[model samples]
Target: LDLAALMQIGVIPTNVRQLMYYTEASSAFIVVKLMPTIDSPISGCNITSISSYNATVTKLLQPIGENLETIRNQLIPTRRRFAGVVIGLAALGVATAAQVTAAVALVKANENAAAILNLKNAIQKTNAAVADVVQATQSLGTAVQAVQDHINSVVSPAITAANCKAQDAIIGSILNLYLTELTTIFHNQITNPALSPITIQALRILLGSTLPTVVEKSFNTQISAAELLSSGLLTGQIVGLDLTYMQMVIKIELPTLTVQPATQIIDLATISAFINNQEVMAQLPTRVMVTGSLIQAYPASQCTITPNTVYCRYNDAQVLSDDTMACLQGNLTRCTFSPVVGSFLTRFVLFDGIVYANCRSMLCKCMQPAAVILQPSSSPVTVIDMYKCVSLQLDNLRFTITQLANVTYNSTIKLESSQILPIDPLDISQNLAAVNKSLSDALQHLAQSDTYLSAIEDKIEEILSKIYHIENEIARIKK
Candidate 1:
């Protein structure tokens, strides 16, 4: 009967059954305990308020689930169900205050446990960051070593070679500068010995006199000495002869002996004065005597004659003598004197048969035509042995006289017949006899016996007259 009565009381049955299930069944109370927060609203029962209260409850339940997971990890899930039981009893107002406090403490312990787990995860991340820093430090050290290797293997040697090259260039430049200076010195002075000290002085002054005065003066003095030595060498002096070391302090000015050609020579006495010691001069043998004869001669057989004149023989292979040279000298002086006077003569003789005289006139005339008388008397080749003795007598004579006055020969030699006779007295007669004898022999050989006898008789008288005239000319010459 009562079961029928309670079935009619529905509010009492539903509310009472929910509280019983949440407080008694541990597993069934979880869903039953959440029904009070869902169904019985804490704020005023409006849609917006209900939504807000549900979000608040959801937020509160979110941490509880997270907290319970934490507790479940730390303690077994079935053993932790007592806290859920306690939370269910608290929700239904059936548990004590201590039990509710214990449930809050368990939730707080779960939150503290979550905070410690997060701190552990932060420490692990710090350790991982420290390991990464160590790795980066090692990599940086390797990179630094690589840079140092590059410096040692590549850059250092390159720099060394560059330094060597630069040093060599510096040395070469210094040597080149020195060479240029030497070249200038050689070109300006030593190579050209003829370069004058005055020119060097002028150049020094033009260049602002950079050279020291003593050095310049020394160079000038040395060059002058060199020039003197050269002059002495070329001018035939024994340079520095008879020189003492003390004498060398003074400038050497040796005399250069000059010899005149063929006549004037430097005497030993004068050369000895320059040498100041005759013995040294003798020992040195500086003097050379050139001996030459002044006259030349040759055989008279080498002489030749022309039709009108004879040329004197000379020894052309030898030098001239004073005697022959005087002849040339005399001719040169004679040209300055008055002109020569020449006396010349020619003569011819005709052998005609006779001469007629004018009884008182004392002149002779030719009377015979001799060619008619001289014709052959006998017939041709008639055995004519008849001898004709013809007595030839006085002949007519013709003579010529010629003279060229005031004349000379080549302006270097004189030829005068008057002066010629004293040296060779027979010269004129011998030449005239040679000519006459040649004609006489030719005439005698040319004619046959018929004309030959008369020709000889005719020439005999002409020869007598010529011999008389030659005797008179010789007598005149002797005077």
Candidate 2:
């Protein structure tokens, strides 16, 4: 019965039974309860007078059910029973929307969790790298100290004697007179006496400056010994002369050998600089074991060359005297000048092996070429022998870097392209020789490097161009 129809009669109020359903896991249940609403109705029930109002309301609901029934009747009886299918479809739409919302939320949460884990992993990797760098630095610090102590122990006593050379001059009638006048007795007494306090004071000053010289020299010796050992030059003796610390330098050129105690003839500061400097690291081999032989000889060459015999046969592996250095600088005009590669103002690079002169002309733009070598870790012993066939100086006092493994080396020491104006051979030959020699000293132990002097040869061209351009530009400005 329709609720409107029942209400018209007013004798029996329409009522209904309502059910609420819920599911737990896979199970489903419904609870029935009385609903204080209208009752279900049947069609074709007529009424009069008081029931007229109920009949009118019945007409409205009747049309809605009739519409569904009319569509269902077109199907079979079983399909008519499926009037509940409409209700099921609405319910399905609602359920699907809810599930989709929940699934999206769960996926988002999972992504956040995974992101957090990844961040943690990245941080751990970064921290590990930092730790490695710190550990390496610490170990290096200890090694540097050991080297310093060794140098000091050996060189301090020799420092007292101060084995230095007297001034050298060739006499000409006019110049000889001036030279003799320069060495007056009063001046000699003031400057060079065995027991005189004035001589002692002067000697002390000289020793003080020479102390750093000793440091640089001893450090270079150690570095070379390590190289020589790599190259199979193991049968040589170190110079035994005590000027400031150790009377003699010992042979321990093997890079793989443990630097023992009592070899402290150099300063630790210099050794540390060599070890940690960026210029050295990129240049040294991971494991160096080789020997160097006299590659070639040049006489009064245009480029700088090391004097090998002094280091091996004579106790004369010393720096050029200041006056001698000035004289060499003056010879710049004799060699010619040009620009080469731009470089670290006071730094250079070098390595072991044959340095070829593959350059084609007198004019060359150049830079310090980085040399490298690699050998099996299993073969750790190495020896190197550096021979110079020219009259040159390998000034140990000039080298500041000591440790080869950690030194940072510039890969492009020389200019390959003409970016810098002085990319000429002459400029590099004249200005960058000592720095290159220092680099050569460092690489002598690594057993890698070829064509070391090619850069010097190539850079001379740029030097000439630079001079010409500068001259032309000056002329233009003057005009």
Candidate 3:
């Protein structure tokens, strides 16, 4: 009574109160919360944000404190306090193990989440831009139609410059509208503008037999109006523009300028142009015509190449149909055959075609160094004979590309490099087209990549196995 009264309580009852103060918590008392389970699906996880991790660990501390409380409660129990102590301490071990396992699991999922998240971002951006690119191509498509239309219509007549009507209109229109517009639209969109091993799977599948059956060819062309016309002398006039989609051939023909409606002319002229172009395509070699001028009149040497009078004053451009362009009336041996550049199958002609000569020695005809002049008031000019040159043709002179087709230009794009990014353009030491590496190629490229990530897997298994061990321990405990 004396001791109890001092504290205002009963001694034995206080001991009883202390001993009976705590009992085992219910089986549900551990707050059965769990982390994301292994193999659970992840969607748009906030793995990049540390806040999610922070929140996880912070929430974790709460239950853990309760776990400590769990132990403390057991400490006040009587002799069974012994069993409570073991149970509390052991369950606390499960709590801590699960915490470690969950925390480590976050990191495991997090790294890949970040990688896959970024990859998805890349794909999304690409997919988005693809639609925009299609729209841009349509813009280009209409502009192309405008150019083809303009070429077929107004550019139908290749008039000379300065008269200002069609020449200025044609040249300026093409430059200002088509060429400049083409440049602007094409470039404006793009000023403008991931996998290594799996690339082989994608690329090989994409560029299969359908993509690389691989045949290549070459062509020889002459862009000169003179070459296409093959007439005597010419001044700039409208032969008519024969445009076949990509084949924009504006041949200048000067029979005379008969201005009809541009469209009508285009249709009529294209009819002729189609015939001419077809003819040119059928016969590839150009008919290099022969020509002569009055260096000196030969009969009595009587013509002073001045006023072009009939008897002597014969000068101001008179057409001579006499011995001109005829076969040099006597037998002559001359002009050897030879080849041009290695550009066979390409557009040939050094601008001015070729020629030949011969026989002061009766054994050979040397190529005489004939003088040439554009302005020939006092010069020896040879205007080629259109008639004679037509009669004697360089039949099948279109063999420039044939030699190359027979001997060269079997070029091809290659598919040898793995799907790796290039470090530098100037890095010439790397063999970009070397796809043949499998020991290291297969293993190193395939297995070697995982070396960068193996630690995570090992770490995963490390925690995973420990978690499995801890789970069994958890299940063994009686709540």
Candidate 4:
């Protein structure tokens, strides 16, 4: 026999014996320790049941088979007796090393497998979460798109190109004219609920699509235009249109300044406040007939004769606080701007207690900031509080979920929502149509000369452009 082959086989038998030894110990741990052992004569542990187990025989037979092959291949050395003794020692050492290495490897493999399983479970959970978020976002985007499209189609055309340019010129003029009427009605005709209701309702209806709606029965008591119009309380007449945004404002010209000019800067705040206030306030009423006429009067047309207080619009930003009033009264705040600097005394009166200008007159470097104040008695109740509730719920959910799916979790959401048809020219056209229809029969009938109608048609184009821009911007909210 070859010496190397004989040595290799000799080492194998020793390892087989070691495996047998460990197997017996494992059996004892499982069978005797884990299960109940009968109180019998030879029962230190129940090794007697070894023969009864079928798998035990096969397991034991494997080691024995390896040893048998080695036994047959053994060869004698030149120094027979001494070599035999040395070979046995070496074989035993090899066997122990092999057994230890095998056990360690098995344990490592099991741990790795378990870790992989956990990773897969996490991936599945993440996929589901992502799908949910994507769907939700997509749905929201689609909805926003649809609304923008509708608004462009239905409301955008209210202002048109040629008319928009013309109206841009007349925006302040028309608004100012209406403002005079609105203020008069509000200040003077406090008793006629019918006229008040009509004026408030019409304006509110126009603004309902964009601004915050004041709810009924709020602790603040803000009135709803619908309520005013339904009650028929609001009534008014407009004075002549003025190109003047010549507002009564406080400003400084220089050191020891008397009053500054009514610059474009002042007009900026004045115009903004005036528009916002009117937009919100106008919804209080619609047109009503004065007995014989089926058609309603344009809120902007009447000049001079009718009571301005009976149906007037107030800019909330013009009102001042008690502290502000004291400051103005004490001359702690100097009136530095505008020709009608004296009007600043009455400027506080223009807003109907809904708002006020900032203390920029005293605070200088910063321009006047608009102040919003609530007047308890004049505030109306509105019906749009329900939308606010929905918005609040969404905000809460976003906050809660972001906290949970913290930084460690590789989180993502998949969006799968219905596509919304983009806003197009047709939509703007519809809005234009509606606005034109609201115009007087004389304006509509003057199609032949197209004088006034032509002007309005021009304005419609500018309005359509604004509508398109809004719709386009909202379209991106989706995926």
Candidate 5:
């Protein structure tokens, strides 16, 4: 056998057996070289002879050492005899070492595989988490966009519409307020029920007979030139009565009349008291009449009276029959002459019988009648009749004025009611509420997305750490 190969195998087996022995034993085995014990020939050997004895002892040990060498030489074949067996054992030990190394490598491989699998699972979880974060971010963006669109399209317009309705309601209220103001002003101005007809009649009298007689007749037939000629005293009587009323008012001290809002019914107490006062009534005329008239008594050329004779359109004169001719012959006496041709006279009298005559020239003379016929209680009858006419006309004037005022009031009220319309507040409130809720939900969604993103960041960091640990484990296995 090659000695070096044998030595290599021997060295392996020796170490293997030694390891096995020590593994089983409680304590280690140590190799020690021991010298033989020396025997002295003489008893109690002295120190003076020690050196010589030591020389002898050394000589004796030289032989023993030689003997040991010779014996070691003699044991070599015995060792050579066991070398074949030792080589086989050494080969077995080498094989055992190879198997142990292989087993350790397999266990390391299993551990590295388990770590790699864990890293793979962690990476997959991180990927899934990141994807979730991305999806949530996109959803949050979509929700915000929807909220913005709703504000632009629905919420803004709804607010404008609600504002418009509110404006309309305010405008309606203002219109009604104005209507009430106008009606109130009209009522105050047109308060007196008698005022309407009084105003019409005053206007007519002011315009007078300047208009057509037919038109004037439509209002009052008696208020014309022909009627004035027949009854001229009537105009003067009314004018005098009006003046008398004014004079009485100027003289009397009146109570302070507090002008107030008028009621639906006429209250005539204050006015009646003023009219019926004793001082005022004393000024009213008891009787009224015409005082004068124009007349043509006789023709200038064809008729004459001279000295108890009268002539009319003839050469001869007739003698006077009655005493008026004889009375006319004197200067200062009145006469009732006989009837003559071509002679005329004109006369007029007022309703209360004031007589008048018309004379054409200075030649015709006239005198008042010696006796006048008078009616019984003429003054009271005249006064009472005038009062009745005035009272009836005043009542009709009051009724007309009241009717006109009421019609105007009702019309204004109806017009104001027609202008108002309806408005709704609830619709605007609902839209605002919906917008607020959408914004709240959008905020919540954004917060959730941010939370998910933060969680994804943590997961990514964990995956990275796991991958680093896997690298470290792989390096350790290599070593």
Candidate 6:
């Protein structure tokens, strides 16, 4: 039964009775309700189990052999052009010099990819000499993806691979198969405590690998830079799942979630009556210090910003309210204010009596918005809050995640999160609106940048004929 020619080559064959009729109720909601459940903030180590996590991993394994001789002297032109092309292809016995030394030993395992962010035995000895020169050179894993596709077709900036997650490339075919030195099977399945997928990617590059967006001290929901799923459609067509149905709700996703609602205002008055209102902190923009260090200053630099106030911007324009006041001489909302044009401060909360404002501007083609206004000697107020769920670190999280996968439940985050909303006061009025108004009045009144500079000079003459065809393939690969 050539199951329709193996579903015409897409191969969907798998059945323990198709996982007892499609993955036994999502594999008993992942092995009896979400596998035993969250332990050791999902791994770093376990002793009793906190000797300051073995003295912060022995102060990040002490100056990593003097930070690998200052990263082999800041990777001296990729280690002297890979030690002058593996000492001139091991003295020219070049039988395709094992495919140009597996394309420069997978760029010397991502030029010791900053030794998995600073020496975990120099990325396990540059990922075991890039899996021992990619098993003596067949297809050299497309020679480390043709030098990361010619450094993403350019002089530099884009380089990828080495997200040691591998759900079904199952961490690069289990480090390309090394049940080595009598099956400690890489320290009992990815080395125990941060349960060792190389110390869970060295504690996600020391607790800040493109960091997650928000949810710190959160109360009743908050989010972004979130989304993921399809771990080979739940580990081979929905069989077993956990770590939030394969690490946080089916591989972390929830896009187009546009919510920028933050407007907590309370000001009875006094950071010394808005810092001795020289009619409102001399109409803003103060505390400056950038002197001649670039050319003049001889006695080193002196930094400042000690007693500065009334700062909040992204475009403000609301002159000031609460009975417009010149230092509230019997208030009636005047320049007893906190913004002009449009800029809402995210802070300014001093309460010996009152002044607690935490604002943020909204986005959706709406006018300047970002706020935090307050005026309360007492006028019907009861605000209780706690919000901080950080994502928008910037999405598809700085790309690079090879597939056939389980870079531990596979994901490089960032499906969405582009928020830094600043400046607002009725700018997209409280609890914000949408991209409406006839799709912004059916695209009218929009000009300048000299009408987009003749399609940006015909896309910079097609990127200078793709940089003269990559400088004629680097002058035919330097002969």
Candidate scoring better on lDDT of 1 and 3 = 1
| Candidate 3 residue lDDT tens string, 200-292 | 222122112211111000012232433222322121111111111111111111122112221110000000001111110111111111123
Total clashes, candidate 5? 3
Instruction: Please list the Cα RMSD from the true structure of every candidate, rounded to 1 decimal place.
Output: 71.9, 48.6, 47.3, 46.9, 78.2, 32.9
Estimated TM-score per prediction?
A: 0.11, 0.12, 0.12, 0.11, 0.14, 0.14
Worst 10 residues of 4 by lDDT: 25-34
**lDDT tens per residue, model 6, 298-385:** 1111211112211121112233322222212221222222332222222222222222222122111111122233323231111112
Which of candidates 4 and 6 is the stronger one according to TM-score? Answer: 6
Tell me which residue pairs clash in candidate 1.
Answer: 294-320, 294-321, 295-320, 295-321
Task: Write model 5 residue lDDT over 274-357, tens digit each, in one string.
Answer: 011110111111111111221112222332323322222222222332332322233111221111122122111112211111
Candidate 4, 1-479: lDDT as tens digits: 11111111110101100000011110000000001111223212223222222233233233323332232223112232321122322322243433333223222232222232223322222311011111223321000010122222322224434444443343334333433433442333222121112243443332232212212211122435454334332322111011111111001000111111221100011201111112111110122111121112213222111221222121112333343233223222221111112123322211211122221111112111222222221111111112111111211221111111112211121111111111346865895787677776657666756786787898999899999999998996787
By lDDT, who's the top model here?
1
- Which structure is stronger by lDDT: 1 or 5? 1
In model 6, which runs have C-alpha deviations exceeding 4 angstroms? 1-60, 63-67, 77-205, 208-210, 214-224, 228-479
List where candidate 3 sits over 4 angstroms from the true fold.
1-346, 349-443, 450-457
**Model 3 worst lDDT run, 10 consecutive residues:** 264-273
Candidate 5 lDDT at 280 equals: 10
Q: What tens-digit string does per-residue lDDT give for candidate 2 at 70-136?
A: 3223322234232222322221123343333322222223322223323332222231101111132
Question: At residue 121, what lDDT does model 2 achieve?
Answer: 24
Question: CA lDDT of 71 in candidate 3?
Answer: 36
Query: What's the lDDT for candidate 5?
Result: 0.23
